[PDB]
Amino acid sequence: QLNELLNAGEYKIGELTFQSIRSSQELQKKNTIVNLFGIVKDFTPSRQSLHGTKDWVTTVYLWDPTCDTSSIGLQIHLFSKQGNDLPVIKQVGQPLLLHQITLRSYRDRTQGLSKDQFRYALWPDFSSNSKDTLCPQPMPRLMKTGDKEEQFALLLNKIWDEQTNHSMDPPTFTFNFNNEPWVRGRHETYLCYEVERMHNDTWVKLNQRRGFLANQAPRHAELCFLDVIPFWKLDLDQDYRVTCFTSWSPCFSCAQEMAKFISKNKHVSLCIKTARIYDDQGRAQEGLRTLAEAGAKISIMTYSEFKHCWDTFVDHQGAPFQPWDGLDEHSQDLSGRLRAILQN
DNA sequence: AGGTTAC
Ligand SMILES: [Zn+2]
Structure with missing residues (x-):
């Protein structure tokens, strides 16, 4: 059931259509808005920007099986006016569902930039030693997901851990x-x-x-x-x-x-x-x-x-x-x- | 002026 989802580029879950990270790591000249769903391979806490519009920003690198084991993942900058509504990630390994992310070039690497309306949903690192890797998330941008994307998230988590735990x-x-x-x-x-x-x-x-x-x-x-x-x-x-x-x-x-x-x-x-x-x-x-x-x-x-x-x-x-x-x-x-x- | 800010 999971093998064939990630091949064609697009795969649907719930009602949202997702694009694989490997396919996302390519580009067109124009900006295109995708849904993502992957694992936090690395992140940077929400600090406030020092230039430009000075919006708050958190950085993630999503990975999914379409990227190899050693691959770090897609660079995604999540921005927000308030900033106290950006995802609170505690550790590497959390499943992450991002809604409406723009895809563009920056000095020849693909990044994702958040849309204004961008929403998210987080899950704990299931195969970690701790329970509380997932802390209570800010309410404005958070999405109410079900059991269907529970399977998917846990699956991605399980495969991630069973590649980063010798x-x-x-x-x-x-x-x-x-x-x-x-x-x-x-x-x-x-x-x-x-x-x-x-x-x-x-x-x-x-x-x-x-x-x-x-x-x-x-x-x-x-x-x-x-x-x-x-x-x-x-x-x-x-x-x-x-x-x-x-x-x-x-x-x-x-x-x-x-x-x-x-x-x-x-x-x-x-x-x-x-x-x-x-x-x-x-x-x-x-x-x-x-x-x-x-x-x-x-x-x-x-x-x-x-x-x-x-x-x-x-x-x-x-x-x-x-x-x-x-x-x-x-x-x-x-x-x-x-x-x-x-x-x- | 959607992709500066982050970088
Ligand atoms: Zn047996």
């Missing part, structure tokens, strides 16, 4: 990645992924193109991982190989979706390293085979991987990886158990 809490890593064959009460799947580009006949090792994520209650971590893939701006000619590192092997249902991903993407290879083998003693074993037979490459995490995930996806803050007793022992029986699965 680091994880160290006690979390210990507990979830404990590779003892049967454990309680992990319940959730933690998934740490790498991306590798094809250049010079060998994988270009991508440190900044990494990420990790954890599931919701009751979708799955495997599905949430697949959602950020289309929003990677992947070169269609270049072949890519994903290696994700999971805490639990994917269930039967997510193994099917990860298999149907290999069928949909002809330039993407999928390689899975898991810490435990999830066996529901139902169709989970078949799911490993089905994903396997679809082209995907699965194996058990060994000491090499456990060190690497601690060197990459954890906020060790200087502590080297401290292994638990029986890590190699459990990874051996599991390597036997995995080998037995692909045989049946």
Whole structure:
């Protein structure tokens, strides 16, 4: 549902027609008034101008999936006579809906300038650690939105965070990645992924193109991982190989979706390293085979991987990886158990 | 004089 919205340039939500940020970053000679809806990648507090009409101004940089991960976004200057009605943004990551913004050149970069009537709507950084990233906004310019643009805003937020959050809490890593064959009460799947580009006949090792994520209650971590893939701006000619590192092997249902991903993407290879083998003693074993037979490459995490995930996806803050007793022992029986699965 | 001010 979200992939195709951002392609044509214009997409509608509620009753308002939005223009993507990438498409907005181009220009015509004349000024054209668009609706925007994105993430605050950076902003500057509302200070009063020192020149010209001296109106109050706040600065935002909106981003959306049509811009790459590393892209800062569209420069937008929001102006107002009173100024005490401009959006009060508290931190980077807030979803932002802007209504009636003019698009023009300034010394060859595209900026947005606010119309007089410009209105807005803000949302908290949902995937932040705080609740109160969103404080009570000034009433004059504020817009009453519903649940429909709730989905959209949260979606953009979720994709943003799942591109600007590599680091994880160290006690979390210990507990979830404990590779003892049967454990309680992990319940959730933690998934740490790498991306590798094809250049010079060998994988270009991508440190900044990494990420990790954890599931919701009751979708799955495997599905949430697949959602950020289309929003990677992947070169269609270049072949890519994903290696994700999971805490639990994917269930039967997510193994099917990860298999149907290999069928949909002809330039993407999928390689899975898991810490435990999830066996529901139902169709989970078949799911490993089905994903396997679809082209995907699965194996058990060994000491090499456990060190690497601690060197990459954890906020060790200087502590080297401290292994638990029986890590190699459990990874051996599991390597036997995995080998037995692909045989049946 | 809609795009100066912000830059
Ligand atoms: Zn699953």
